[PDB]
Design a protein around this ligand. Structure first.
Ligand SMILES: O=C(O)CC(=O)CC(=O)O
Ligand SMILES: O=C(O)CC(=O)CC(=O)O
Ligand SMILES: O=C(O)CC(=O)CC(=O)O
Ligand SMILES: [Ca+2]
Ligand SMILES: [Ca+2]
Ligand SMILES: [Ca+2]
Ligand SMILES: [Ca+2]
Lengths: 363, 363, 363, 363
């Protein structure tokens, strides 16, 4: 007996739309008890005051609890709900449902898709963006690796994380308790939480050594980055949820995952490199895409290939919204489909101005 | 007579930045008296309350007036200043300077780049988005065609237009004169002005017959569109400025212009088709690009290739900003350069959700 | 027979925050079976893509269903949920819970607070913003009056309404059945739905005669308006929910409601007039305020007291957001409390650029 | 000889609108050679990418240069141009023209309006938000104080300052020279620049002693604040421009200035205190207002009088824009006129969440 991971990319009409998942359950294509993780793009602003993330999670947990005959708390304690807000540009709201079954297939020669889930403890507000978050996330990434039955960190192609943020109220509550936070800015606290979580991935997978990580390097030393980490902050949770996605020889999945790294926001070559790494070597094989998952960010230099842009200066549109619109459009122009996962703010995720990109594809 | 058109794509540090144009004049590469048109991307929001367009026009007219020893009003009567606001995503602020001289070189056995300029009369607020603007623009397009020495409408590849819009103050002005405007929404009035101007192009070039155009069809009948029209609305002007760009046998330019039409916002094939129509058939020949000029818009269906997006539903970001970020990113991923011209809102400019795209290239 | 209305203004930490309402129920101060209506301010953008309204309604319906031992569908059929998004400026998110019980005490001398609730039938897309909605709302307002036991329309001080809007699917469905909608714009359909609902109130209360109302007058004739109507649009419902709030001789409530009409967005005199109409005649008595409820809008003239503003020209901030922030600030400067209900878009609710304002106060 | 200060509040139709000033000059009521300072509200977003400030300054300097027969550079060396962007809510765009004459008019009984102007040297990027800017501003405030013929710092009621900010290019320059900037964020650099300049005012006027000011206290110790300072950041200048406004015994002005300090954003009592300090003691005498000038900010506590708001959490609308809309709305409700000067970001200007407010009134 081995594991078989099935992945379903489901378009949504609204944050609370569960009809697509319900159709796959009522037809028997998805056993709801075998759902291990759901990764969504919700049509909020994707920043601090984005409540479509919790709206989407509450609706899915409410639906799965009534189908499984259990409580909502038991659902959210077992299944990872990672909602990335912000569907700018042509990016299509959707959810990606990860299902894991235990089938009895012979050990075929080769690595197939594997998935592992792990949660961290709740963090205090004054712990975000600091080593407490880095070390706790690294421990959970190793836990999710064994949950996915993956030994070689080279076989990990994507580590999706949902992490907390700071609000004005939580920063006030920390000041009243005599504590200091990593940054006094709610929007900027999302970057520190994403960066600390990303460095935790690189630490766990051996991508960077521990003697290089410190509080002063977080969101400062852009030479330190993971090539597979993908982290997203949200007001709706106080801990970190980790989804490790890779390939294992002890897998009966009809899917594989490959990945690459975009050097900048318009790096279309990395998109095709990630497709080839997933077994898709031509445009005619593009129908085997299950989903594309990528990180996007505005370069700290304020330029792309020596060309100035205003993402860091635009006070009307936060730069994470612009980055999502840009990279999603780039990926959409390559694969012919805008319904792909793009998350903004790639601190320590790929180089400065770039980010990891993975492709889940049929075989 | 023998015309030679030279085109300079100049990066800008701010809306009022004239240093790049001043350097090209002081080096002798540009005779300021031969400048006929300037097409700019300014880093305002590109909608109603975008004053970077007028800031850039005033700065350029003031500089050219002092260099030429003439008044600012004589400059704006002679040189077309078309400032398209909105540099979203990775799009780089810049201006494109068109210089036309009468050289004594033989007509190479082929059509080369030609440019023609024409202005319309000022419109009253109640004329925007109606037949008065359509017929007046149609006349100016023919006027600019003979300025470009282009007889066959088949040889016209891009018609850039700057047209007015409605503000709350101008709508009140029309009411106090007993007149009603085409729409009581300032942002939506830009669409009516862009569409009426675009229909004037299609009428002048024989793309649609006049018996099919009417007030009720403007911004309603999306079957009527020009394949080369590119219109941009602005608060800083009260008339329409026309720039006809094509190829003519009476041209000694070392440049040509080709074009295609994007069927939707992610139509990368149309970008490559426009490149091939301009003589670039491989990635290695892409260094011959002078500039790429394209229209972008949110499709009225709210979808791209059957995939929903929120451009028409996002009350925080107007859909013309989203469309500019998307199509510029797509073009940038193809040509490797985000410093290209993309204008949003393509009413009657290409199909619904698409727009014409032209490339000016060296030979 | 005898009614007692209790009103609780509860601050919320997020759209899904039910802790304040839960504390009042667990302490025994609120019997959840006696809740008849909940009027909330949710911290979404208050425009088209505001999902905090459904998020807040879903959370309250989910919580009350488990406390009452009934289904969520039965809760929304029993309790009126009117969620007004947009808490701009200093406006404090909160909910206002209306409790109506049947006590066995005689009606104290004078008229005391009375509340009545009624729902309309579901509307087809082609009926919104037209006479079908006006007459249907008018019927329900008259129905809710006797449910509140109010005979004299002079004793009605506030009519809060939640009304539907048009979406891309509902518009396309109407043309599929050979019908045309009042407007092809989702945001503008919210204004027509608010205006039609407001005209239904004025018709029911005898503020305007039926011979003056027609399809052409809806959102056109700003001389026709109600002085107590307060309407708010939302995507989460297909009918109109009506809350009539007034004073009745057959009431044992310890509260009363008075009201006035703001002639413009900065009409502080109207705020003080509404306070005295509710029995508060000095600054020292402001602690008797339970809540202040007001409508806000941008004047169609684009001016306030002869002074231009940019609300109708600002493409970065929707004008309904600006209007809510202004009137909330004006009320807060008078009562010393920014936690008051202010709803935007006051079509036929007060004069053009103004709106009704009511005060619920202790006696 | 004796000085006479005349102040003109002029409504504007656009950032580049000089028609109101031209009417007062063409009528002979204003001698353009006697203009010493112009304080404007321009309808840009009032944050980083607000180019209406430079647009207004360029348009006004260009106009006054042609009227005076001198160069534009000589005008900006002579006249203070302080353009504060952001006209949110109902706030009316306008400019305030300060004219100073040497008349032979009797010394009115009392101290009357006096104005003084002074400029600092240009600051290097590493000097913004630090003691170099504080000490340099303090000297210029003393220079403008004696320029206004004001001896007692108690007679200074308003010190308006325009200060620079940091851009990506200026940060690289400081980095290339081996220097570090106070903060690596363009938007937050406006706060540090505003705070350092404000502390320079308090230092110059003796409001706080020098031993309390340091680099670590800037934008941290909110107990240190000036009660008359009003600072505004802009990209269009590299130094600080200071306008000292007060009352002097050596003045023949028909005007006086009083002031108060708003304790929070809704402190209407402070508005009335500023009116009475300026000699306006009843509602009928508010027609003597020339202009009201105030600072606004979002309190770092995220609350107003114990009531939560979303200004520090709103990722769609910058909190300085919200603060301007609120405080302008509050002042408008008191004086009945939205055309008053309100500036956002009040670091070390009044208490945390408050700001100085001054009134210029006729006598
Ligand atoms: O993932 C991103 O695009 C940025 C983020 O952390 C917040 C979110 O997704 O809601
Ligand atoms: O009531 C308002 O403030 C505006 C509206 O109609 C939609 C909403 O409530 O979100
Ligand atoms: O003065 C303000 O309102 C805030 C600021 O510094 C930037 C500006 O003025 O544009
Ligand atoms: Ca990165
Ligand atoms: Ca089009
Ligand atoms: Ca109204
Ligand atoms: Ca302050």
């Amino acid at each position: 007996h081995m594991q078989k991971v099935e992945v379903f990319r489901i378009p949504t009409a609204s944050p609370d739309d569960i009809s697509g998942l319900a159709t796959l359950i009522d037809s028997g294509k998805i056993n709801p008890a075998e759902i291990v993780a759901i990764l969504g793009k919700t049509e909020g602003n994707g920043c601090v005051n984005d409540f479509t993330r919790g709206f989407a999670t509450q609706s899915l947990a409410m639906y799965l609890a009534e189908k499984l005959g259990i409580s909502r708390e038991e659902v959210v304690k077992k299944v990872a709900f990672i909602m990335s807000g912000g569907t700018e540009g042509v990016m299509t709201p959707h959810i990606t449902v990860f299902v894991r079954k235990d089938v009895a297939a012979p050990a075929a020669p080769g690595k197939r898709l594997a998935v592992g889930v792990a949660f961290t403890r709740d963090f205090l507000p004054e712990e975000l963006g600091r080593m407490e978050q880095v070390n706790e996330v690294a421990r959970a990434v190793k836990e999710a690796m064994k949950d996915a039955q993956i030994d070689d960190p080279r076989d990990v192609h994507f580590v999706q994380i949902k992490c907390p943020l700071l609000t004005a109220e939580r920063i006030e509550d920390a000041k009243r308790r005599g504590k200091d936070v990593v940054v006094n800015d709610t929007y900027k606290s999302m970057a520190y939480s994403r960066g600390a979580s990303a460095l935790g991935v690189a630490l766990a997978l051996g991508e960077i050594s521990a003697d290089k990580i410190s509080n002063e390097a977080i969101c400062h030393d852009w030479n330190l980055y993971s090539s597979v980490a993908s982290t997203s902050a949200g007001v709706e949770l106080l801990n970190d949820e980790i989804i490790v996605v890779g390939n294992s020889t002890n897998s009966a999945s009809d899917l594989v995952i490959g990945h690459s790294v975009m050097k900048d926001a318009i790096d279309a070559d990395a998109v095709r490199a990630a497709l080839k790494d997933a077994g898709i070597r031509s445009d005619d094989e593009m129908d085997r895409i299950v989903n594309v998952l990528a990180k996007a960010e505005a370069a700290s230099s304020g330029t792309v290939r020596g060309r100035r842009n205003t993402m860091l200066d635009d006070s009307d549109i936060n730069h994470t919204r612009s980055a999502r619109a840009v990279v999603n459009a780039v990926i959409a122009s390559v694969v012919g489909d805008p319904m792909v996962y793009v998350s903004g703010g790639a601190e320590h995720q790929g180089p400065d101005g770039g980010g990891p990109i993975a492709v889940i594809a049929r075989v």
